[PDB]
Structure 1
Amino acid sequence: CRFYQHKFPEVEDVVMVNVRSIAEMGAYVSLLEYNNIEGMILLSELSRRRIRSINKLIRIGRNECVVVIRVDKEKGYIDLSKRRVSPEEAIKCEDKFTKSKTVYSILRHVAEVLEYTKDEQLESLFQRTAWVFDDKYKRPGYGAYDAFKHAVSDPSILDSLDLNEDEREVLINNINRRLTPQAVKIRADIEVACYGYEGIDAVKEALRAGLNCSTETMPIKINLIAPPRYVMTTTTLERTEGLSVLNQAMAVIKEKIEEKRGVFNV
């Protein structure tokens, strides 16, 4: 269904719909943030200015970041807006939906990992996994609480979503299989250009301690890519571990080269 505990969009709900088929006045477009729920567009008000064209190679299957004017919770008609849109840029909701496709797809087998998909007991599948985040206040809350889950190695088996199978055969591999987590590896450049004949040994000395501080606390691999330049590529999985790799590198470059009186750039 959807990973939203709420069924329907609300008033002025900026929603991401799916352009299935173009119809007479417009297109019966179906939401995907909320399950599959149909909405409508033009005749009335979607466009703002007049240039009189709609498509050149744009075939089918588009998604429209549109704002709910009218919603019929009983009858089933969701009137949508883009003429009102000065600030509701399409990039933010789709990239949220690019997450929220995977945020849903993580939380809809589940059904200890095969995965299947489809189907388990669909509503009870989400109260245990998908809507229990949406129950977990607030809505900016489970923007991070779900992100706490698919930051998988930071950590895996912590705070609840201890529901329901146990969950944990999914929570190890199927989170990594459904999300396929991406993509950050932070390069960390240290260019130490000493020009005399004294402080250039301190470049090598802070490289010597740069190995040692990468050996003691074990950050990864302070390298030499050039005689002035010490560049490491810090893989980051905890969203804060790359700074601890970098700041222990900068502490060596700042102080050990100052001991033998050289200059640096970092």
Structure 2
Amino acid sequence: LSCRFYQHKFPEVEDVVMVNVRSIAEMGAYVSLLEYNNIEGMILLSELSRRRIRSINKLIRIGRNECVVVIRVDKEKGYIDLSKRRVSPEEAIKCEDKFTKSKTVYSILRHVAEVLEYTKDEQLESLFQRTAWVFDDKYKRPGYGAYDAFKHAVSDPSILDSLDLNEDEREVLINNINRRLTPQAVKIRADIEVACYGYEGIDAVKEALRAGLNCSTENMPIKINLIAPPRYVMTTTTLERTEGLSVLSQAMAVIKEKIEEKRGVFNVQMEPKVV
């Protein structure tokens, strides 16, 4: 039970596709196009590298996935010429991210069709054309548009209500999207050693703790706990950890400023790191 990843059965010219090498011949390397329902392609022996290559098996690695640019395509003859020489590392990283997002969308729709028990490949292809390829044709972006629409539907399900597949198929697709692409959970923990060996030591410590807890933003409460007498643990359980680490660093800087204003030391035992 399989299908292609996009609405086209064949890739365009100069389009970088993700393949896996299946066999080695004298004319080149027979590969399978993983995002086009495992159609057979060929990476040429002249296009495997920019350097004189003694053997095809020195850089083939049959069983390894690689990004190759299409040089020649023939829909009538069934000939697909691929090339590893033309692709750049930036284009390879772009093709890897695009193939990862398209494989995630393929796994989500495969789980949705397994929940719907659609054993026929034509009904599964109609679910593909009604869920992902419509958004890919509307946004004019194969792979990016369907994944962006699914990431928007995981937050706001009004985009999934426009699909007219079925009454239960849309709910199963929304449940699969919310179970697969909505893992918004992180915990940015940090340790800070704030104290004050002065007159009002515990009072300044409680004031610095209240000033650090007051700087906690919405949906990101910086919870302070007494892990030790001289050390404290400032945890933060929230999504968007790139912003959560910055919020924890800002709270630690505010606590250090409040400790230094009341003549007290404030050391950073641990920086903002995810748990």
C-alpha contact (below 8 Å) 2:23/2:62 kept by paired residues: yes
Q: How has the CA–CA distance of structure 1 residues 158 and 247 changed in structure 2, closer, same or farther, with 3 Å as cutoff?
A: farther
C-alpha contact (below 8 Å) 1:109/1:117 kept by paired residues: no
TM-score, with structure 2 as normaliser: 0.69
Q: How has the CA–CA distance of structure 1 residues 218 and 57 changed in structure 2, closer, same or farther, with 3 Å as cutoff?
A: closer
Q: How has the CA–CA distance of structure 1 residues 215 and 137 changed in structure 2, closer, same or farther, with 3 Å as cutoff?
A: closer
Q: Structure 1 stretch 16-25 or stretch 252-261: which is displaced more?
A: 252-261
- Unmatched 5+ stretches in structure 1: none
- What's the CA shift string for 1:198-255, capped at 9, x where partnerless? 5664333332455577799772633344556544443444568736964884586267
> Share of identical aligned residues, percent?
99
Q: 1:172 aligns with which of 166, 171, 174?
A: 174
Q: How has the CA–CA distance of structure 1 residues 161 and 193 changed in structure 2, closer, same or farther, with 3 Å as cutoff?
A: farther
Q: Structure 1 stretch 14-23 or stretch 205-214: which is displaced more?
A: 205-214
Rounded to whole Å, the distance in 1 between the matches of 2:142 and 2:134 is 14
Q: How has the CA–CA distance of structure 1 residues 163 and 191 changed in structure 2, closer, same or farther, with 3 Å as cutoff?
A: farther
Rounded to whole Å, the distance in 2 between the matches of 1:117 and 1:183 is 34
Q: Structure 1 stretch 115-124 or stretch 60-69: which is displaced more?
A: 115-124
Rounded to whole Å, the distance in 2 between the matches of 1:215 and 1:182 is 17
> Hey, what does 1:129 align to over in structure 2?
131
Rounded to whole Å, the distance in 2 between the matches of 1:186 and 1:98 is 26
Q: 2:216 aligns with which of 210, 214, 217?
A: 214
Using the TM superposition, give the Cα deviation of residue 121 of structure 1 relative to its aligned residue in structure 2, in angstroms: 0.8
- Unmatched 5+ stretches in structure 2: 268-274
Q: How has the CA–CA distance of structure 1 residues 47 and 108 changed in structure 2, closer, same or farther, with 3 Å as cutoff?
A: same
Query: How well do the aligned residues superpose, as a CA RMSD in angstroms?
Result: 4.6
Using the TM superposition, give the Cα deviation of residue 65 of structure 1 relative to its aligned residue in structure 2, in angstroms: 0.8
Q: How has the CA–CA distance of structure 1 residues 48 and 198 changed in structure 2, closer, same or farther, with 3 Å as cutoff?
A: farther
Rounded to whole Å, the distance in 2 between the matches of 1:160 and 1:239 is 32
C-alpha contact (below 8 Å) 2:224/2:234 kept by paired residues: yes
- What's the CA shift string for 1:105-151, capped at 9, x where partnerless? 11235347366666461331112212133123142894585375389
Rounded to whole Å, the distance in 2 between the matches of 1:6 and 1:106 is 20
C-alpha contact (below 8 Å) 1:4/1:33 kept by paired residues: yes
Rounded to whole Å, the distance in 2 between the matches of 1:24 and 1:69 is 19
User: Number of matched residues?
Assistant: 266
Rounded to whole Å, the distance in 1 between the matches of 2:260 and 2:127 is 60
Rounded to whole Å, the distance in 1 between the matches of 2:216 and 2:60 is 52
Using the TM superposition, give the Cα deviation of residue 17 of structure 1 relative to its aligned residue in structure 2, in angstroms: 1.1
Q: Structure 1 stretch 72-81 or stretch 133-142: which is displaced more?
A: 133-142
- Tell me, what secondary structure is at the counterpart of 1:70? strand
- What's the CA shift string for 1:161-186, capped at 9, x where partnerless? 57544445424543365569487543
Q: Structure 1 stretch 119-128 or stretch 189-198: which is displaced more?
A: 189-198
Q: Structure 1 stretch 97-106 or stretch 62-71: which is displaced more?
A: 97-106
Rounded to whole Å, the distance in 1 between the matches of 2:252 and 2:161 is 34
C-alpha contact (below 8 Å) 2:193/2:230 kept by paired residues: yes
Q: How has the CA–CA distance of structure 1 residues 152 and 28 changed in structure 2, closer, same or farther, with 3 Å as cutoff?
A: same
C-alpha contact (below 8 Å) 1:110/1:116 kept by paired residues: no
C-alpha contact (below 8 Å) 2:190/2:234 kept by paired residues: yes
Q: How has the CA–CA distance of structure 1 residues 71 and 163 changed in structure 2, closer, same or farther, with 3 Å as cutoff?
A: same
Rounded to whole Å, the distance in 1 between the matches of 2:228 and 2:119 is 52
Using the TM superposition, give the Cα deviation of residue 46 of structure 1 relative to its aligned residue in structure 2, in angstroms: 1.7
Greater fraction strand: 2
